[PDB]
Design a protein around this ligand. Structure first.
Ligand SMILES: Nc1nc2c(ncn2[C@@H]2O[C@H](COP(=O)(O)OP(=O)(O)O)[C@@H](O)[C@H]2O)c(=O)[nH]1
Ligand SMILES: *S(=O)(=O)c1ccc(S(=O)(=O)Nc2cccc(F)n2)cc1
Ligand SMILES: [Ca+2]
Ligand SMILES: [Cl-]
Ligand SMILES: [Cl-]
Length: 168
């Protein structure tokens, strides 16, 4: 079976684990150890083809640059998550983008910009417009998600796998 290697990236508290665990276990997990990294594997049927998704839920603990680059080099697609309620996490997505591009050397690396916590509209700090503009500058798709309501959770994982399938 095709194995689609997905890596979750983004700064702390944006929803990397909550998104992963909603996708994996259909549960909104609000207390997942912030420093714990883990891998998840699931068989899924992608546009009628049984595939395996492998998700690396990164937690930012790896500080040795060669090892961080090794992890990114093994990834095939990236969900680059920020929280719409924390402007600084949106700014931080630029760094993850650059790190990925240095390692993958391919501006067309499968990559979604993911604005999570769409259920907290009253706390929004990042406008839809500015996130869409960034995605347009990078030529990536922008999707807003909620790990709490499940809004667009399957979409980001499936659409990323579709990009992996098409591009690699
Ligand atoms: N309301 C809301 N809270 C969220 C959402 N995603 C994550 N959270 C909360 O934000 C906190 C950090 O989420 P987590 O997934 O652990 O962030 P990570 O550090 O990026 O893995 C937790 O308390 C989650 O319950 C969301 O979509 N909506
Ligand atoms: S390794 O398997 O021992 C490992 C994997 C992930 C992490 S992390 O998620 O805590 N930090 C990190 C940062 C950047 C990329 C990446 F894959 N992981 C630590 C050790
Ligand atoms: Ca986490
Ligand atoms: Cl791991
Ligand atoms: Cl939150």
């Amino acid at each position: 079976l095709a194995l689609h290697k997905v890596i979750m990236v983004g700064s702390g508290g944006v929803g990397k684990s909550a998104l992963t665990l909603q996708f994996m276990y259909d549960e909104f997990v609000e207390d997942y150890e912030p420093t714990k990294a883990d891998s998840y594997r699931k068989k899924v049927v992608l546009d009628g083809e049984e595939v395996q998704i492998d998700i690396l839920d990164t937690a930012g603990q790896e500080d040795y640059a060669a090892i961080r680059d090794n992890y990114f080099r093994s990834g095939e697609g990236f969900l680059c998550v920020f929280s719409i309620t924390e402007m600084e996490s949106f700014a931080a997505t630029a760094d993850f983008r650059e790190q990925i591009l240095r390692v993958k050397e391919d501006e067309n690396v499968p990559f979604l910009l993911v604005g999570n916590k769409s259920d907290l509209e009253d706390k929004r700090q990042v406008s839809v417009e500015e996130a869409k503009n960034r995605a347009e500058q990078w030529n990536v798709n922008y999707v807003e998600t909620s790990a709490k309501t499940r809004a667009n959770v399957d979409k980001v994982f499936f659409d990323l796998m579709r990009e992996i399938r098409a591009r690699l």
